[PDB]
């Protein structure tokens, strides 16, 4: 009944992977490399903060912020542009608004049972994800 379901999620599968990086047109590559090399989605939670992370063999620098801080643009490693990225707790889940200019990066989570969904978008695409908690 509170934002602390602390665990792990191997992410049973991925619908779209490169196309999300594709959507923001990072480099129409990495789809052949980043494919999957341990990709373990994780969640941490601290109280006033929240930093889900991926323990991938390629990268470990994912959800890294505090709630309501309002991540007023300024990103890089992925896109490298400028988009309002507001974060909020739903009471149960992490709702964030990618207030874009061109795209709708609108990335959000929502515990859809015994796993944790990550239903984002990014202008045109719509990355759908499925998990299975631990």
Curated annotation (Swiss-Prot):
Gene3D superfamilies: 2.40.128.20. GO terms for biological process: fatty acid transport; retinoid metabolic process; retinol metabolic process. InterPro entries: Calycin (IPR012674), Fatty_acid-bd (IPR000463), ILBP (IPR031259), Lipocln_cytosolic_FA-bd_dom (IPR000566). Forms a beta-barrel structure that accommodates hydrophobic ligands in its interior. Pfam families: Lipocalin. GO terms for cellular component: cytosol; nucleus. Intracellular transport of retinol. Belongs to the calycin superfamily. Fatty-acid binding protein (FABP) family. The gene is Rbp2. PANTHER family: FATTY ACID BINDING PROTEIN. GO terms for molecular function: fatty acid binding; lipid binding; retinal binding; retinol binding. All-trans-retinol binds at residues 41, 109. It is found in: Cytoplasm. Its main location: cytoplasm. This is Retinol-binding protein 2. Keywords: Cytoplasm, Retinol-binding, Transport, Vitamin A.
